[PDB]
Ligand binder design. Structure first.
Ligand SMILES: CCN(CC)CCOc1ccc(/C(=C(/Cl)c2ccccc2)c2ccccc2)cc1
Ligand SMILES: CCN(CC)CCOc1ccc(/C(=C(/Cl)c2ccccc2)c2ccccc2)cc1
Lengths: 236, 236
């Protein structure tokens, strides 16, 4: 219903966090192998990234969350295929690439590619493409707690100086703003341990559309849902 | 659609956390004053509490979240009216009453009534009636962080002993289990800073029904939604 020219008339969130899910369900739905669904999801990452760069979005976060060895090794090579394919098309769009999570659970060849893509994009000031690999909201909160405790132990930080502001700075999204919008696909209505502190005041849009089928139109429909939320009477 | 005898056939969550919202919208909808809507919400708390005690629920958490002086003072006296009216009917049902949040933002007369109701219900082992007054998820997380930092400063706790388990114990819901189900009313699809750590793996049910209109039937329908979620193929 909502077209591109209707969404550009409306407010564009500055930070959108999408939960990409349903790659496997989409492979079964199409009688394809699972790794094919993960490949298609990798391509949807790019379509969405370009669309969000067009719309004025400033930060865009992506998260994708047992599996046999083959599928795990295929997944841990998708970042390299994604960067060896679309990194020139992203530096051309002034997009900064960053990664949040535990990088130590990636193999070296993948981390080198990731780090190179980050460093070739640090001098940019356009949209931010934020990837969550091996990311746990609870483990982020506990690690911020533990670093704060380290600083208290050394004596460089007094316990009465800790507040919501200082605590946000110790999260993996420190130089970032909280997501104005959260999107979740595959039909699940949960958070599944993603950015718990950050989605406190975030509008949640849920949708049964699987992540490979989430192209330009469904993203626009999600933005129309958001914008209509913004323009609801009755008060609060 | 789902009757009581259909819901009792299915799985009953052990911990349900409801976000009571829309008391004001319900007062306007019925041309009543706002304080009347808060009174009706107070009565719905009891209907729901009895229904959940019937269904086998073990813990039931309730949260209700600027206003003119009159409405604030009326609200801070609703706990006493609620306890002076329904506390015998709750001790008769073996319900334990507890309160989480900042109690120091209540006046003394209210805190004395609350504390008395807690102490007259400590010797019970039935359902738990958990009230969130002046409760902030972010402030709960930061306070747990700060107590942990205090224990590290004194030397009674080493920083390598802190984990998701130990961190849960420092939240206001320490002796409690995470909510299997979260319900939110008034049509809003957000969390609004409620139990961020706890709803990590919690099924969220949203409903436009205002909290005064949330009687027995809508609670059953929410439980049917949950139970149908539990019995969905396609996998994960
Ligand atoms: C098997 C290892 N898992 C943990 C189980 C963690 C590592 O898996 C992942 C590997 C790649 C990605 C990923 C993309 Cl672009 C992807 C997006 C949508 C659907 C599927 C893959 C990516 C590529 C480059 C940078 C950042 C992200 C996400 C998780
Ligand atoms: C004005 C003060 N606010 C903060 C703005 C905090 C204090 O307000 C509140 C006062 C009472 C309650 C409340 C009940 Cl039962 C209630 C439930 C549903 C709808 C309206 C009221 C209650 C009674 C006894 C024990 C526990 C809860 C909740 C918040």
């Amino acid at each position: 219903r909502y077209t591109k020219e209707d969404i550009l008339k409306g407010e564009i969130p500055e930070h959108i966090a999408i939960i990409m899910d349903g790659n496997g369900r989409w492979a079964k739905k199409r009688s394809l192998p699972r790794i094919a669904g993960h490949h298609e999801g990798m391509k949807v990452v790019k379509r969405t990234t370009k669309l969000a760069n067009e719309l004025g979005v400033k930060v865009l976060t992506l998260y994708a969350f047992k599996r046999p060895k083959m599928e795990v090794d295929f997944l841990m090579k998708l970042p390299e295929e994604f960067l060896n394919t679309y990194l020139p098309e992203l530096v051309e769009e002034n997009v900064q690439v960053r990664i949040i999570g535990d990088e130590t659970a990636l193999p070296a060849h993948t981390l080198r590619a990731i780090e190179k893509a980050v460093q070739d994009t640090a001098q940019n000031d356009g949209m931010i493409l934020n990837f969550a690999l091996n990311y746990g909201g609870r483990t982020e909160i506990v690690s911020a707690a533990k670093s704060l405790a380290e600083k208290v132990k050394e004596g460089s930080l007094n316990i009465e100086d800790i507040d919501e502001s200082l605590f946000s700075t110790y999260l993996m999204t420190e130089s970032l703003q909280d997501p104005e919008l959260l999107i979740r696909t595959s039909g699940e209505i949960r958070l599944s341990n993603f950015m718990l502190w950050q989605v406190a005041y975030s509008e949640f849009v849920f949708t049964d559309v699987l992540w490979p089928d989430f192209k330009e139109d469904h993203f626009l429909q999600a933005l129309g849902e958001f914008q209509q939320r913004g323009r609801r009477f009755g008060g609060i």
